[PDB]
């Protein structure tokens, strides 16, 4: 503990994370079931040109890199707009349902740290056909009164799995307000009109202003993209048998 | 060492814990092969009024929020009554059996910290009919067996006790804490609320709690849909993580 | 980890402290070479009617107790307000130089955690007379000084700093927190509360408390008494422990 | 704490690696779907007659001695050129995916505290095409493609990198140090000798290192003779330990 | 293992930090007998517009805040220029002979890891005067002691080298880092600018910085106002610490 | 501070060297041709050797042998009496997937107590076996070619696997000398001449003096002794499936 | 798991007994009389040993010894060629509340690299000396009486004080042999003949062969040094109190 | 976790010592005041020629050899019997108080894993009185007491125990093994081995341990001659250490 210190790791020797932030809102985008979630997420750090802020660091990530698109990065990371009042926590690999707990909690606690007062997981349950599309919520009693107003109602269904799961046990125990936007997706077709309905969600329930102009084509462009990873990863983990 | 205190955290940094409960009996309730003791459990935290005083957090609880009915909570829970005299352990999903002992222990860690004087581990056991005249059944030591015979509550029988009940019981005894099983028979397949209503009687017998019971089977029957539903959903998720 | 969690301790197990505070503005008061700054401090808690949160334990703040006015309490605490936006640190016997560096460093750990704004250090330096238009002085960073001046506040004129002053002030320089420090020119023998009232006016000025100060010269006179008990018997057992 | 000291060591005692090494480009050949990476590896060590420098020492390397031509070596080696601003990382058996995490992290440090400026992944991806237009992929930061590019070489066309360069490059973009990955068509079953010479091209461009690839041809026939011996001895041991 | 690294921090996660160092030359200047040391390392701090990088964090380190010159600032900094070539090391307030192994040792375990090439240590000793033919001594090896012989400057004269600047000279030469120290005679009573001005020049000849010397006397007698103040309080402190 | 007994001090002082003259290590492991650890035996026997430590360690099975009815741990080194000769043997296989560790461990310990030679001792499966048999090395350079002279020469192998290559490995990072010495040995029948072959080799190359009166008559009865014991672990080894 | 560098082995693997040949080490250190670590600088110099460690401490005075431009550290170990002999010298006094924790540091790398003796040069403190010089030797009973033969004979003192008795003392725990030579040395003036008895005894009871030529010559020249070197060290200590 | 593992040292690997110990009965003579409990010790193992078995090592041990009488040993050594069931401990250099809690605490640890069923401490109080009438005090626990008062010794007449021997009890009482001391007057400057005859017979009546006695009262003076000496040379170098 006689030790030299640097700036610029001020926060970090300290664990004083949560100063060069403002009590940010936290929105999650993991890639499970539907692409919905990290479509989202992308969307929203490009339109608001949010920058890296941290990766999430773990033997059990999957080691890969993604380069679709020919841009190279990790699949685990955290943006931040400006004003550091929102944060976008997106991954583009799939966590394995054996790791949920780990990554959830490494994860929540970074998030705690930061002074986060809201995370938002964002994600898409799969359809088959509606044009009106509903939005569904998971939270608890006070925040879905004040979304049933705003006309999103609860979503029916009796557990909540996935990294979404995990993040709410982790915020129901650590007494951050948690909750979760889920929208029904179509899953072997692009299916732009999923993001739309949860960045509408979110800019009206939080207030902030993500622009909407041109969101279908480059969700579509994304989208292709996302699904040749679905893919090279569906064959990687298989031949990873030898 | 060297620290610094907050307040309502006195018995956390100090293990300090017993100081703020009154000696209390522990009621539990598992998700195993029967419903019967999460539901009698959550009966029990609902006609008593009791308020939430623990979650117990661990990688080997599946990682899973509970949202049934629209209200959204984590699936282990310990509730206590205002005399902090009686505590509803309780969860809502099945544990792996690959975990019973991790769970086992770290439960009983906090349980033996807290000062209880028993820990009762509510259960039914699969049933096929069953008798019109249900009876309950005790795994306890011989002073508790004799004493719950003197009540009409015979000595279960079987050989070994498994799940969560079992690991509970083995902590107990390594401990030397009371710790004793009530197992009823239950219907497996349809809602069976005189289930529940026999572990409540039990319990107000031999513990003299004040455990109303008009529109139990009621109350019950309700809770029964829920736990279904759940029970329900979990094996499809894992039905699902299989192909 | 695989632990339990109890209620009122998340902020403890999860170091998830700043939570429940709102940004708050710690105001410190120690026992040094003037009263000033406890008198200040337990002034503050006293008018606006601060709750305790904490102390702040550690084998080298003296282990005596204090009884004076036949209230009982430890010698290190820390208040809030009830919007959790302004917090006392106080401290009522002397802290030996040796261990400047350890407590001042168990404090701030806390107070970083917490998440607070500003530290503002309060106290008085000894002097002669002195001036009836008793300044107040500063020692903080450029922009803050610069802002005071337009206040009539000036740079305190010392090389250096020294008492748990300066041992929060070097943590505070290098946890990059903003932390800053009141000095007022304050009588070192007779009782002084116009030095208190000179901190507690500047404090509303720059911080926007809202500080009664009608009959703060009476309350101020009464905790001289009592504060200069302590020092008084604190010396006197300081004597004995040497022949 | 308090220890004795010996010569050569202190890159060691005091972890004071960069100090020795002029800020290396290191250059990587791992066993795996294609031998190209290694061969290139072997060819570059033999022709700027490199000097051995380290070992990766683990429980994931498999525990196999190589001796392929009579010349018994461990499996994993590091090698420098007399100036250290050049190594060659190579790994003569592959790594089991379940641990591309361990051996990519522990390589990671070493070459972190190195002071490598630049790590090169060669690999070849497989097929039996093999068109002349026997081209080189660049995987690589945004700047970097834009050179590689203009420099005659262009996005390798994959959505994720898996393998040890998957593993690689997600430390050297955590690490904040330039990584990247040069990637040519491979005849799986055919040695393909032409793969080695597109990547030593790609590198004696880009780095400007100048590798003889006089009789290139030749001594990476001679190579591949031995690399696939030892993946054929490395696939029927594996199958014999299925017991 | 299982960390969320930040962006601005890798260097600290990882140990990285030689990475963002172009070898550095490491110039010190502690509070010893002379203020010779410190008035060169502020000095060159001011000269080669340094910024600050890094504070030496320690119980032993007197726990004192400096604001002389109303400028609040920790005692131990740290800085380097633009290029990352050149750090200088400082300490304003002096550091107790029973820790001149620790803190050397702590100050050496950062320079070693930020690639550091060679540290030169910063001194005055004590004279009146001085005749205007003013020499350099230097403590080095004998390799540099001969280049530096054809340069006017001298070997010091001392069987031992005490301070600060022993025990870094002993970290160095048990690391094998290429440690110097020029030492100046300077008066003690009267302000003395071209002692410092001696060893800019010494330093500009051994390492080809090129430190201006513009207005130099101006400058240093202004920074030798404020050490003198500090010097000066800072024994006061020392003698009050009694009680 | 801590008392301290007499006979411990090469233990508390990790001091172990100090009672071992400098010796050559001699290996045999259960592997695939069994004539490594008979050649183990046989001279244990013959130089009449005492046990000087054990190998411990979860990952060797952690079953006694019990053949001929001489109980024993599995896993045992003894020495000559002027501790200028050891011999590491280990009479039950080692599963591969341990190699690593087990190889560590006993190299750990051979390194402490300033063994000079690592020589491991093989067997290799053959159907034949000529009429003069031969030994061959696997080793570096410089001593493949003082073996030149002697008869021995390379080892015709890309890799070398088992307890083997994991020693090999250990010894060429920590800078040890170690080789190996192989000879065909047949499969089906008892192969004694195997034996007789390596210590030949060993005899000539480190010139220790072991006798060779009595070798095939004792080799043989090993050689039962060994099959049975293969034999009942490869039952056990089916056995526990359940 | 750890990558590892070449010359390191003997680092990592703890395997530093390796390079060195069973040396006898010689031991100098600032006491009393200064013929100690006069006899081990000259000895290094006539059999020209090179470095080959140092004692690293938070107990050796923080100080760096500049006598006659040579700039070094106070505590260091040299090794001849062979390294059949090494030499520990320590050229400023230990504080005697640090006596054992230098000893035991000391001992656990001359332990550790495998030494054979240790042999601790001291002067003794005399006004005189005699005409023909004697040597008394501190050793275990076997010794002494090798030594007796040689007309060195037991040193008359109840007990072993300075590092010479917290070695001797590690030398009995760890059962390594320590012994201890002593000559009578002239308080107030250099007395060179005191180094030229303890060669002689070194150079008759370990058939090293040090030369004797220059070292009136050199020893003087060196006295000179450590004379400086004591009366600047006290100086400092003294300067020290405020 | 998974070791290699050597012959006789099985007690160590494993902590496995009362194995080769019969339950021994322990006497200890510690060099302090007076120096009739290391003669006490020496004649003893002397006498029944028993054979070293450890040594007690420690940094508070004064690190000195000694080497009366030309045989070099450690200060600190403990004796065995052949049946192992009497050891002398004994100690030739006095202890500093500051330590006699850690010296206490590690001998009791390896005399407690040792199995020993009874510590005996043999001392001296001081004087020049000295009645024949030399008798011999107890200081035990009530039973023991009893035992050697029917046996015609009687309670030592203080009222605290110091010394090794107050540490050595204070560890026997909290440990519950048998501890008990032995004392008797003795001739603070005259050389006394009456004292040695009065306890060896203590001894001997109360253990029946059988130890020659014969020319005793030679021996004891030939080992008081050494005793002395080192206690002489042992104040000498003590005086000396005032810089």
Sequence with gaps: ??????????????????????????????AG???TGVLAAS????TLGMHQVAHLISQHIPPVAV???????????IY?????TVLVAMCEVPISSAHIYEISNTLMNWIDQVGA????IMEGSPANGPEERPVFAVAEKPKLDKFK???????DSAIIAGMGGGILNECLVR?????????PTSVDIPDPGAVLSIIEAINKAYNLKIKTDLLEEQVKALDEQIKKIEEQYKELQEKQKE
């Excluded at 969307?43 to 490009?46: D, F, G, P, R």
């Excluded at 380069?67 to 990371?77: E, I, M, S, T």
């Design 43 to 46: 969307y929203i750090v490009e």
């Design 80 to 84: 931040a707009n400006n004003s550091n």
């Design 1 to 30: 503990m006689i030790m030299v210190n640097k700036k610029a790791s001020e926060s970090q020797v300290m664990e004083l994370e949560k100063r060069n932030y403002n009590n940010p809102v936290v929105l999650c985008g993991f």
């Design 33 to 35: 079931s539907t692409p």
């Design 67 to 77: 380069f679709v698109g020919g841009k190279l990065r990790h699949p685990f990371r």
């Design 175 to 183: 007494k951050i307000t948690g909750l979760s936007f889920i929208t």
């Design 149 to 155: 107003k705003a006309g999103i109602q609860p979503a």
């Design 117 to 120: 007062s809201e995370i938002v």
